Symmetry: C2
């Protein structure tokens, strides 16, 4: 119950949430993993560098671990180690984890995840704050919502389209319900960075934004590639490779969400192969295999995939004009992220007053480099709030 | 045994082939279809027009038919109704169906399938020839090979890359082995049209080529879009939509063949959803549901998918120069095919001496309009041989 008390200005009632997956669901997951088949070996699946996707060796090993080493209960207990709640917004059940401070002057911050992530991606950071502060000394209110369509949050709606602006509207309303209408800051990566930009652009309660992803093309009337250094050019090269050789998954999410939704819902191995590839290719240092199995099992048990990809038709079909962030804007650069563009480019998309360049780390910053992201966010808030 | 005798000039021995899937394999297929799960309904899967891919209604209905109405034996008997053989080429087992004439002057023709097709796509055409001729009067030798990686043909190799040129080399060698080194003609659609073009371009034994697909962009120094009619422009519009909204599947096949190969090998429902979408969207008039189930079951039982997509990295990463077809070139235009470009454009890619424009029909011409494709091919051969 420590860090679980709602701010005095919150207008909603606390509805504590606990993850409790029935044994039957875990048994059926195991059964389906066991019955699932693996593709026959091919030239492509035998390439150790995995330039064609996951290897047969990796998938075979993971399937075996999922059946003999994997245990959901310990992970579930970990999920339940932090305060969690649910509240209804526009008919949707919105789940969120949080660490609330008892300090009246604490700065409200919403940490937004992306795909194939979830609220759990921020647990390592919440853990650091919990180890370093007490409810009476915590400088911030940390809210980690599950975006519509992800894990324990329901939706999106079945009778109407839902996009990035709708996601932004839900996040802003949640913060207002928790009593942060006078102001809050947003931290976002992946899809959360798209939502975060929209919040910084059109929602007044959002006072500042810190992102670790700025997907963009060469600026209009700004710095050209020829004005960039060797290191910055290597980054642009990596971005071009991602946009040409690494975006197929996104194009399928965007153009045929119904088909891929059904494909990945049919077998847990299908889901593991598709999402696992990203947990393997988007990081700097390899993640523990059990971490990947936990994340995939979480998506499977909550039927997240088919509901979460609705935003791809908008992120994967301006930044200097209509979507320019006029409010204090901060950025944390990790070299192995998907689109490592230079500071000069990011600076054209908003009032960039804070920039931190890191030597290591990939796409899942909160998971890979929690100390660095936490440290960066703290410095940003202290500077602009 | 009618139409099964090899030409007198064949250098290889006939190895009759028969399809015989063990009951156990059929039982496991049924079991996996039953245990497979379907995605929860979403806004996207409830769209009747299916602009986002297959609908929940369709997949649910097909799964039910697969379990209660589908019977493999009758289809298998149909597969075995025509002469089939296997032969080894470069270490690969190459399967092929055929109707051999007893006439010494019969024109050798190889009919090449594509993805998600197979040799069976040409059975309706072989059926028409068998009903209209006897071995003594058949004017052509009709060879329908299974390209490397498809159904009963093995490969591609596990220790080296394999591409379109390799496929062309195998087809040319097969025809030579059957004794057609003095000359043969090729008919091709989909991937078969890419292989067919390469055969017309660099293999001397190939005397002429007839295609029903000519994937291309606006010609270099040739006819512009402004020089096209209203009908032709509508065709170009359909091609642009396919290239922008309908190519995601190909981009995944091209960039991450290992991942998607494993994804679709995990469950028969995953395979049905992915391939079924194409059998639904690429045709003019809807195909019988049982036909789709038969084709998908064939791919499943032969583990075709992961092995067949190797060519996408080359078809989905010139036509006026290096790949220009100097030999007699013919084309059959079906309005609902994937890339319906105008005759003026196709004419820039080869010595086009034959063109047939049809009012109806889609991508699977051999399946959809067998009478038309057969007659077009016959007219072409008579004109250029």
């Amino acid at each position: 119950k420590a860090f679980a008390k709602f701010p005095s200005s919150a207008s909603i009632s606390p509805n504590p949430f606990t993850v409790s997956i029935p044994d039957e669901q875990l048994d059926d997951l195991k059964t389906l993993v066991r019955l699932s088949k693996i593709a026959p070996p091919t030239y492509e699946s035998l390439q150790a560098d995995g330039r064609f996707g996951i290897t047969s060796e990796w998938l075979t090993t993971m399937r075996e671990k999922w059946l003999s080493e994997f245990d959901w209960r310990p992970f579930e207990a970990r999920l339940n180690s932090f305060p969690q709640f649910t509240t209804e917004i526009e008919g949707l059940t919105i789940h969120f984890a949080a660490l609330f401070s008892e300090r009246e002057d604490a700065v409200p911050i919403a940490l937004l995840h992306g795909w194939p992530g979830s609220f759990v991606e921020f647990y390592p950071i919440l853990q650091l704050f919990r180890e370093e502060y007490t409810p009476e000394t915590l400088p911030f209110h940390l809210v980690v919502p599950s975006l519509p369509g992800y894990t324990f949050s329901s939706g999106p709606p079945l009778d109407k389209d839902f996009g990035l602006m709708d996601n932004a509207r839900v996040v802003d309303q949640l913060m207002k319900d928790l009593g942060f209408g006078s102001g809050y800051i947003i931290q976002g990566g992946d899809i959360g960075s798209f939502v975060g930009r929209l919040l910084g652009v059109g929602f007044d309660a959002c006072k500042a934004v810190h992102l670790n992803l700025c997907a963009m093309r060469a600026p209009p009337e700004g710095p050209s590639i020829e004005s960039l250094s060797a290191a910055e050019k290597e980054g642009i090269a990596r971005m071009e490779k991602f946009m040409t050789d690494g975006l197929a998954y996104a194009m399928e999410h965007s153009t045929r969400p119904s088909t891929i939704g059904h494909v990945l819902s049919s077998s847990p191995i299908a889901l593991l192969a598709w999402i696992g590839e990203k947990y393997l290719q988007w990081v700097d240092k390899p993640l523990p295999s059990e971490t990947i199995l936990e994340m995939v099992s979480l998506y499977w048990l909550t039927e997240s995939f088919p509901r979460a990809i609705h935003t791809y038709r908008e992120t994967t079909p301006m930044l200097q004009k209509e979507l320019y962030i006029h409010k204090p804007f901060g950025f944390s650069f990790f070299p192995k992220d998907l689109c490592p563009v230079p500071r000069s480019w990011i600076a054209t998309t908003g009032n960039l007053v804070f920039f931190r360049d890191h030597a290591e780390g990939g796409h899942f910053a909160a998971l890979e480099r929690p100390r660095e992201l936490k440290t960066d966010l703290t410095a940003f808030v202290e500077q602009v709030w």
